[PDB]
C-alpha cells in the first residue's frame, strides 16, 4: 500500500482506550522537538489538515533533563491550566536550548512573568491541585504507551507516527507527509 504499518507509522501492540484523538509528546530538552516547534511547525500543520471535530493534545515528559525536566512538566501543566501555551512555548525552548538561561524553577517562572502572566497567578497555579492532576494526566498518558522517546505523536491511542520513514531532503515536504499521515490515520 502507499501507507504501510512499520513505514510512516507503527501499530501499538497494546492499544490504549479512551486515549486522546491526536496525542503529542515533547520535551523542552528535546532537539528534534525544538525543530518540530520553531522550524517545522508540526502541530500547526497537522491541525490545518485535521477534520472538523478533532481535539489536539500536547504533553511534556519527565525523562529528559532530570529535576528541571520535572519542573518543566509542572510548568507545562501551569501553561495548560492558564491557557498560555502559545506565549511560553518559544521562550521555554530557547531558554533551555538556545540561550541556556533556564537552570532552575525560578528561571522557568521568569519566562512566564516576561510573557505577562502575573506572579501571584503563576505561583497559585503552580501549587494548585488542578495542576497536580494535570501533571498526573501527562504522566499517565506517557506511561500508557511506554514512552521512551520524543517527539512522538499517537493517533486514537493505536497508531504512532514514524517520522524516520519519511524523506528529509526537503523540510516542507517532510511536514506535509507527516500531516497527511496523521490525517490518514485519523480517518482509519
Dihedral sign for Cα atoms in the order 154, 168, 42, 94: positive
C-alpha cell at position 93: 525552548
- Judge contact between 51 and 188, C-beta under 8 A: no
Between helix 66-82 and helix 85-93 the angle, nearest 10°, is 160
What would the 3-class secondary structure string for 68-125 be? HHHHHHHHHHHHHHHCCHHHHHHHHHHHHHHCCCCCCHHHHHHHHHHCCCCHHHHHHH
SS3 141: helix
Expt. technique: X-ray
What are residue 61's phi and psi, to 5 degrees? -120, 155
DSSP letter for 13, please.
S
Angle in degrees, CA 33, 143, 181, rounded to 5: 50
- By C-alpha distance, which of 110, 104, 95, 101 is closest to 38? 95
What would the 3-class secondary structure string for 26-74 be? ECCCCHHHHHHHHCCCHHHHHHCCCCCCCCEEEEECCCCCHHHHHHHHH
> What structural domains does the chain harbor?
1-188 (3.40.30.10)
- By C-alpha distance, which of 92, 87, 90, 94 is closest to 117? 87
Resolution (A): 2.0
- Judge contact between 182 and 45, C-beta under 8 A: no
Measured CA to CA, the distance from residue 127 to residue 77 in angstroms comes to 11
Between helix 105-114 and helix 66-82 the angle, nearest 10°, is 30
- Judge contact between 27 and 60, C-beta under 8 A: yes
Residue 127's Cα: distance from chain center in Å? 22
C-alpha cell at position 122: 503563576
Strand partners, 56: 22
- Judge contact between 151 and 30, C-beta under 8 A: yes
Residue 151's Cα: distance from chain center in Å? 7
Measured CA to CA, the distance from residue 75 to residue 42 in angstroms comes to 22
Measured CA to CA, the distance from residue 163 to residue 36 in angstroms comes to 11
How many other CB atoms sit within 10 Å of the CB of residue 52? 4
**Greatest C-alpha distance within the chain:** 55
Amino acid at each position: 500500500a502507499q501507507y504501510e504499518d512499520g513505514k510512516q507509522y507503527t501499530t501499538l501492540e497494546k492499544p490504549v482506550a479512551g486515549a486522546p484523538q491526536v496525542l503529542e509528546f515533547f520535551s523542552f530538552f528535546c532537539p528534534h522537538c525544538y525543530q518540530f516547534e520553531e522550524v517545522l511547525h508540526i502541530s500547526d500543520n497537522v491541525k490545518k489538515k485535521l477534520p472538523e471535530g478533532v481535539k489536539m493534545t500536547k504533553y511534556h515528559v519527565n525523562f529528559m533533563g532530570g529535576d528541571l525536566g520535572k519542573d518543566l512538566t509542572q510548568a507545562w501543566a501551569v501553561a495548560m491550566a492558564l491557557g498560555v501555551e502559545d506565549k511560553v512555548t518559544v521562550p521555554l525552548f530557547e531558554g533551555v536550548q538556545k540561550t541556556q538561561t533556564i537552570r532552575s524553577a525560578s528561571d522557568i517562572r521568569d519566562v512566564f512573568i516576561n510573557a505577562g502572566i502575573k506572579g501571584e497567578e503563576y505561583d497559585a497555579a503552580w501549587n494548585s491541585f488542578v495542576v497536580k492532576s494535570l501533571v498526573a494526566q501527562q504522566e499517565k498518558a506517557a506511561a500508557d504507551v511506554q514512552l521512551r522517546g520524543v517527539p512522538a505523536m499517537f493517533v486514537n491511542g493505536k497508531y504512532q507516527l514514524n517520522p524516520q520513514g519519511m524523506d528529509t531532503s526537503n523540510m516542507d515536504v517532510f511536514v506535509q507527509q507527516y500531516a497527511d499521515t496523521v490525517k490518514y490515520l485519523s480517518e482509519k
